[PDB]
mmCIF file with all atom_site columns, C-alpha atoms in Angstrom:
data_model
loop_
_atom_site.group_PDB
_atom_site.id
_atom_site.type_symbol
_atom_site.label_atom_id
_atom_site.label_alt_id
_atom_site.label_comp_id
_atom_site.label_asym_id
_atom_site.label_entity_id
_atom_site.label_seq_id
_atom_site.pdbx_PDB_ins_code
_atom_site.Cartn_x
_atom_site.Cartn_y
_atom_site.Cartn_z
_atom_site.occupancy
_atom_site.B_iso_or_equiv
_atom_site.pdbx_formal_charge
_atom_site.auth_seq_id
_atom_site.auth_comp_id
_atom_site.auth_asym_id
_atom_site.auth_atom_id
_atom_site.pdbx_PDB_model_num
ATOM 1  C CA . UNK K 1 1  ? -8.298  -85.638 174.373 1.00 0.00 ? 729  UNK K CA 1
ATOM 2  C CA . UNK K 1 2  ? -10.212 -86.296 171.780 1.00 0.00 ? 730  UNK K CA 1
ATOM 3  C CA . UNK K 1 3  ? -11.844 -83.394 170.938 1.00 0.00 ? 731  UNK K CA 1
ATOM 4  C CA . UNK K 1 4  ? -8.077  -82.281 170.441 1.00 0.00 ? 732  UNK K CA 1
ATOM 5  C CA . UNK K 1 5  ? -7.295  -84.356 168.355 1.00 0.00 ? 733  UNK K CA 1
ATOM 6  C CA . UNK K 1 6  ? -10.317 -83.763 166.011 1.00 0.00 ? 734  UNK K CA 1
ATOM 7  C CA . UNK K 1 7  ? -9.747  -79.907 166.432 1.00 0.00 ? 735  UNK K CA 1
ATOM 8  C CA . UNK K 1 8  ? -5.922  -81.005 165.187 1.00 0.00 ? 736  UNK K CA 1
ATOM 9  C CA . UNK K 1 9  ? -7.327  -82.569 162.097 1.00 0.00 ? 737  UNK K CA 1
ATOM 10 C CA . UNK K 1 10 ? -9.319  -79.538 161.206 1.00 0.00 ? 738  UNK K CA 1
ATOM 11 C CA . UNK K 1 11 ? -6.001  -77.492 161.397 1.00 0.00 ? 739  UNK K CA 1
ATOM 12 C CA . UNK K 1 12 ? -4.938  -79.778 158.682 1.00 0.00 ? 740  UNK K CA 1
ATOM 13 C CA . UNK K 1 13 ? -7.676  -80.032 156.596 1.00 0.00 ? 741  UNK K CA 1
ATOM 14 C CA . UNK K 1 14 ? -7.622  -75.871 156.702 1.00 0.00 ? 742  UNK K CA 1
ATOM 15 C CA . UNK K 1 15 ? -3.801  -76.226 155.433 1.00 0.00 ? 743  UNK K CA 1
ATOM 16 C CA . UNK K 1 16 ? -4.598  -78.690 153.169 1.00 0.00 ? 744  UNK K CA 1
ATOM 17 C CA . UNK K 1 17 ? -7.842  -76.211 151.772 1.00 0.00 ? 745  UNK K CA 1
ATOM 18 C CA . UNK K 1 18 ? -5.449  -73.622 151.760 1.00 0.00 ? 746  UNK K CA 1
ATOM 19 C CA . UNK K 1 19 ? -2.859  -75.512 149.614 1.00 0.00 ? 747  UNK K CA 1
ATOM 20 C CA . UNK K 1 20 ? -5.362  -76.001 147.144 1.00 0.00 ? 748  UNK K CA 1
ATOM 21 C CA . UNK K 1 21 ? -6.576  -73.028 146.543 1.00 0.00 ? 749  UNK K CA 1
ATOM 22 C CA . UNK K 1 22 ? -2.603  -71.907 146.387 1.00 0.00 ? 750  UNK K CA 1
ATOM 23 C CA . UNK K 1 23 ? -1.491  -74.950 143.542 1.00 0.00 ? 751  UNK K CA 1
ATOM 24 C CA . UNK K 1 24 ? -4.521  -74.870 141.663 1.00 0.00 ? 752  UNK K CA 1
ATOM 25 C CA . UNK K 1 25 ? -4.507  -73.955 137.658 1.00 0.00 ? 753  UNK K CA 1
ATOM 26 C CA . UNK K 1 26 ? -6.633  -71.017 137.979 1.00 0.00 ? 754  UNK K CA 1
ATOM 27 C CA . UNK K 1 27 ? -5.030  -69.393 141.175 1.00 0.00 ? 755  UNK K CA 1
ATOM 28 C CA . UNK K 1 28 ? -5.385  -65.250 141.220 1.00 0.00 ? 756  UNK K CA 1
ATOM 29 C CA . UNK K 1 29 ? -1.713  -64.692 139.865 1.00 0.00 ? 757  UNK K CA 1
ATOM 30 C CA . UNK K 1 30 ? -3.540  -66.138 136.538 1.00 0.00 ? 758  UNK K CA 1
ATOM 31 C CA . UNK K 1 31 ? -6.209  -63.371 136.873 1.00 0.00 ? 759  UNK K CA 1
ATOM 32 C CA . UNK K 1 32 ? -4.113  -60.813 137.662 1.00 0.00 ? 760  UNK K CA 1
ATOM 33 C CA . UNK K 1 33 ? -1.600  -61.871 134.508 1.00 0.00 ? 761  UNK K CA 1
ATOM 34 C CA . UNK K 1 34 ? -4.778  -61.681 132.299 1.00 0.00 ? 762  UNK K CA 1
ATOM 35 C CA . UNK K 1 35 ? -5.846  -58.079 133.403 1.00 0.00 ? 763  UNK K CA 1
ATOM 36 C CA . UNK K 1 36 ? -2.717  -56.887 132.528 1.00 0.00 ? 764  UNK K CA 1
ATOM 37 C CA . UNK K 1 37 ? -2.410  -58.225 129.258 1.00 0.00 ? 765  UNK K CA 1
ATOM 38 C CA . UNK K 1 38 ? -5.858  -57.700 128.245 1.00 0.00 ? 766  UNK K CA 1
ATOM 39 C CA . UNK K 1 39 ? -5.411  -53.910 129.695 1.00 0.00 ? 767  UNK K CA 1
ATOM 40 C CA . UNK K 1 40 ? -2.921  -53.034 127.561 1.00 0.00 ? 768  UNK K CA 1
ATOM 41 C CA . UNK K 1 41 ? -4.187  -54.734 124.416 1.00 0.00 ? 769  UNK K CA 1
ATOM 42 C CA . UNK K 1 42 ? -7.261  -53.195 125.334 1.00 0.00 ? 770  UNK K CA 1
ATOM 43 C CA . UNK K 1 43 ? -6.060  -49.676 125.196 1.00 0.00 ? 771  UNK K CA 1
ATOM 44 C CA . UNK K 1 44 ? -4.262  -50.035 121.960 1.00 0.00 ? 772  UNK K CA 1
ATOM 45 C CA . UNK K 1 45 ? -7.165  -51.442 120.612 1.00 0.00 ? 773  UNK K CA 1
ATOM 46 C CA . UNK K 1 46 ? -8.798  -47.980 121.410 1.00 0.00 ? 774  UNK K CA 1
ATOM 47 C CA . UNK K 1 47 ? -6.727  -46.083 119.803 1.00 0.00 ? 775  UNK K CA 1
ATOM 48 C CA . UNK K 1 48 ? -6.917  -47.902 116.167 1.00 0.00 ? 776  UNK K CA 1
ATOM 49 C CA . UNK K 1 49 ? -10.704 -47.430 116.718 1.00 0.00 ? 777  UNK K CA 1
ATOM 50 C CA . UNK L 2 1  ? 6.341   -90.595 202.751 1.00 0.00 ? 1002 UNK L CA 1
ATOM 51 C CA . UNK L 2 2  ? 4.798   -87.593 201.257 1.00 0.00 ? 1003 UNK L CA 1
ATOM 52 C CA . UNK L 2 3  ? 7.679   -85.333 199.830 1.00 0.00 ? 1004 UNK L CA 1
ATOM 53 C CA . UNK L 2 4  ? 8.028   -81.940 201.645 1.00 0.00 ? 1005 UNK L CA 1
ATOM 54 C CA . UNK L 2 5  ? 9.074   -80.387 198.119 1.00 0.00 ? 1006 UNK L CA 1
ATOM 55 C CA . UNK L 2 6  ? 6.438   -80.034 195.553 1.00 0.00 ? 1007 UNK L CA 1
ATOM 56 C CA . UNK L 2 7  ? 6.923   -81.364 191.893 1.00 0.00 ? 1008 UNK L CA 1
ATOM 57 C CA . UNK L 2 8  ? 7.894   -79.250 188.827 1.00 0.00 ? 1009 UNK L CA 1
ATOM 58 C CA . UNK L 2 9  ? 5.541   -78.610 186.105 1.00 0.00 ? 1010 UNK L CA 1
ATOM 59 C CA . UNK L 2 10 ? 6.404   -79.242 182.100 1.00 0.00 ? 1011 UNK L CA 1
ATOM 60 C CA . UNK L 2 11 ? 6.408   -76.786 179.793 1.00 0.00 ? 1012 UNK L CA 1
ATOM 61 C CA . UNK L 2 12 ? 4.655   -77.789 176.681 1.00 0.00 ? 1013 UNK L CA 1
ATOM 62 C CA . UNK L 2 13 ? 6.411   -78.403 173.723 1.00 0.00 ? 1014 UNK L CA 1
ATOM 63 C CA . UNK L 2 14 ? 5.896   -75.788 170.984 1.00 0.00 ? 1015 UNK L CA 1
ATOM 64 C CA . UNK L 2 15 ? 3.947   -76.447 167.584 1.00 0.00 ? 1016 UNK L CA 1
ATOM 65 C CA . UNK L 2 16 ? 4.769   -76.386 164.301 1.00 0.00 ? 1017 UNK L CA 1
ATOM 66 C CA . UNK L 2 17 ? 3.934   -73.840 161.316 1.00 0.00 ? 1018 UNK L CA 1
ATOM 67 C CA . UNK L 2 18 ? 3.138   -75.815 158.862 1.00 0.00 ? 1019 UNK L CA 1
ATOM 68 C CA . UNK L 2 19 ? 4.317   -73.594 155.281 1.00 0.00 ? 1020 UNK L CA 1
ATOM 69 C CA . UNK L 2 20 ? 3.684   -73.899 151.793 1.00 0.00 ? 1021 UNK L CA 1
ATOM 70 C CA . UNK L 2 21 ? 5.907   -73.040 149.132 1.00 0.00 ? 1022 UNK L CA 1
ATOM 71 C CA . UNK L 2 22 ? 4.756   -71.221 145.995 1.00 0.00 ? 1023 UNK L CA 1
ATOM 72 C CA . UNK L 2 23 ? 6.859   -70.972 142.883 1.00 0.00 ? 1024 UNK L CA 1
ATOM 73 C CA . UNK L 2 24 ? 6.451   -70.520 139.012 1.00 0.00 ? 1025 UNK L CA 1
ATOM 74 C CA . UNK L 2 25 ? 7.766   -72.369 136.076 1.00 0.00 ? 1026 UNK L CA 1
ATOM 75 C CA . UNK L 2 26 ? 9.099   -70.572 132.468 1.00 0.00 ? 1027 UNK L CA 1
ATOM 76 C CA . UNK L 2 27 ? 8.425   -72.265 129.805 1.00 0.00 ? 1028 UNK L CA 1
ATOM 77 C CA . UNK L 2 28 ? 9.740   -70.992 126.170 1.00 0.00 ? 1029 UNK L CA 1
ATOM 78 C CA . UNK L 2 29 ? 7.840   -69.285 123.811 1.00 0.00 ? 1030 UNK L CA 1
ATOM 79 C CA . UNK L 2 30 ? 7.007   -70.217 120.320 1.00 0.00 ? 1031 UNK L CA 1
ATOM 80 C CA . UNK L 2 31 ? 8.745   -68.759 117.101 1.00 0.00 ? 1032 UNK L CA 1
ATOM 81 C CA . UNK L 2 32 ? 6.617   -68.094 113.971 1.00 0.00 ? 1033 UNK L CA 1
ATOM 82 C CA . UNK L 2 33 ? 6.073   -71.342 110.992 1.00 0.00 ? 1034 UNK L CA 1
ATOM 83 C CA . UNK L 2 34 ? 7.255   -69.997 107.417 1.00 0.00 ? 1035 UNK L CA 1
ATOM 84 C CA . UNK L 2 35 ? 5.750   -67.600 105.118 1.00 0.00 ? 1036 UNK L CA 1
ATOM 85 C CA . UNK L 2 36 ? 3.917   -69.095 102.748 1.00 0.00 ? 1037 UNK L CA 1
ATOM 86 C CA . UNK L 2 37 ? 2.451   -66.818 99.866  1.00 0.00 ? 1038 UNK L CA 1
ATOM 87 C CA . UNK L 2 38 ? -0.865  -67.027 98.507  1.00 0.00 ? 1039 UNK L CA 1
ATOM 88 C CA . UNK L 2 39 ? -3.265  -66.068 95.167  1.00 0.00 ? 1040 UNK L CA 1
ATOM 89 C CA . UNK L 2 40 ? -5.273  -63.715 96.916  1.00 0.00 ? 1041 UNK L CA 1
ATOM 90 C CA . UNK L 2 41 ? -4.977  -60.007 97.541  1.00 0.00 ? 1042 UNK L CA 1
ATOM 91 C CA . UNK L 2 42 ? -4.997  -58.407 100.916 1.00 0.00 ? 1043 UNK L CA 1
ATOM 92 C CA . UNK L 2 43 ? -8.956  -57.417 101.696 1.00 0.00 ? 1044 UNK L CA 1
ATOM 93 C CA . UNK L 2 44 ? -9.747  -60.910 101.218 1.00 0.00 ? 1045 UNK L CA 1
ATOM 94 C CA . UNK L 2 45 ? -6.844  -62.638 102.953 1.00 0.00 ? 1046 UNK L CA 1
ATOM 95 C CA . UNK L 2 46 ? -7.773  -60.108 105.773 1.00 0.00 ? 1047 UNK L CA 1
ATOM 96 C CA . UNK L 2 47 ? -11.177 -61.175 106.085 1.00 0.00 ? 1048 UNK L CA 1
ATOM 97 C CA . UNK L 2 48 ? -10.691 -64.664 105.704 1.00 0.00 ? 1049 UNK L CA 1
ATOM 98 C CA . UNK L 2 49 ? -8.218  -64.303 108.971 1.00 0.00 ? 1050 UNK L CA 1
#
């Protein structure tokens, strides 16, 4: 019973990892909002070159 | 005093999926402060910037 219990608190401590990594400041909609923008400043930047 | 009949067995009770909730705020952009002229011409202006 209680190895069930600790295997119950890992479950939560994956959801709480998980969490985390969701409502953190630098979370991959952040990288992905930055490629785009940098893409496309990128390429005009090309073309004045 | 042993019952003929045997006992039912439970059914376990079913656990829960634990979800998170992502969602992303809009905050206003900024306008532009006033144009404000200067003394110098525009080679040196552009530099300086």
């Amino acid at each position: 019973v209680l190895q069930k219990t600790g295997l119950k608190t890992q479950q939560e401590q994956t959801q709480a990892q998980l969490a985390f990594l969701q409502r953190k400041f630098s979370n991959q909609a952040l990288y992905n909002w930055l490629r785009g923008r940098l893409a496309a400043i990128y390429f005009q930047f090309y073309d004045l070159v | 005093g042993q019952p003929l009949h045997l006992p039912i067995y439970a059914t376990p009770a079913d656990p829960k999926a634990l979800l998170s909730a992502a969602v992303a705020t809009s905050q206003g952009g900024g306008k532009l402060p006033e144009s404000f002229i200067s003394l110098w011409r525009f080679p040196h202006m552009l530099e300086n910037a």
